[PDB]
Amino acid sequence: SGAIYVGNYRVVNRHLATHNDWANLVWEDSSRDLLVSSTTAQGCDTIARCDCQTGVYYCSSRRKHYPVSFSKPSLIFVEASEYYPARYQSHLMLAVGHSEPGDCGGILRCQHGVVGIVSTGGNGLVGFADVRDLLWLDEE
Numbered sequence: 001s002g003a004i005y006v007g008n009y010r011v012v013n014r015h016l017a018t019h020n021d022w023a024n025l026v027w028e029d030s031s032r033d034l035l036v037s038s039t040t041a042q043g044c045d046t047i048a049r050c051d052c053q054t055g056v057y058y059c060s061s062r063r064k065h066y067p068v069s070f071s072k073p074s075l076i077f078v079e080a081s082e083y084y085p086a087r088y089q090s091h092l093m094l095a096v097g098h099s100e101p102g103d104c105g106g107i108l109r110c111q112h113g114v115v116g117i118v119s120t121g122g123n124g125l126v127g128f129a130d131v132r133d134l135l136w137l138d139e140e
């Protein structure tokens with residue numbers, strides 16, 4: 001589990017969104033595994049605006065933050081899980097690291113701020129849903 005709290009937005013994995021998220025919906029995209037809902041309180045996270053390919057992510061199944069090298073956001077085939085059939089996921093970045101289903105939501109960050117959240121796992125790989133192109137998270 002986990003979310004990004006930027007401005008009056010909460011960014012979560014679409015497959016982990018709650019009823020309150022769907023009832024306060026700002027934007028969602030199944031192909032990216034992302035959903036954004038509105039919040040009453042302002043958050044403290046800042047979004048990175050860059051093309052870094054190195055950063056650090058939080059792994060809840062290890063209680064550890066790991067430094068990783070990751071690919072650029074791309075269209076990647078992801079195997080079936082209990083939330084989606086096997087399909088192509090867009091804006092996804094891969095790295096070598098540990099990721100169990102419940103690790104979804106952990107933040108990946110670089111020197112500029114939050115880059116994305118854990119969205120996929122298995123086979124010794126971790127995949128992150130990028131948020132750096134969502135410029136509207138910084139306003140309104």
Ligand SMILES: NC(=O)[C@H]1CCCN(C(=O)Cc2ccc3c(c2)CCC(=O)N3)C1
Pocket residue numbers: 015033078079080081082083084089099100101119120121122123
């Ligand atoms: N965004 C997505 O499509 C993900 C959301 C739902 C779940 N998805 C995952 O990848 C999560 C995942 C984590 C660990 C494993 C596995 C899956 C299958 C193989 C294995 O041995 N371990 C897919």
Ligand SMILES: [Zn+2]
Pocket residue numbers: 048049050051052110111112113
């Ligand atoms: Zn960066």
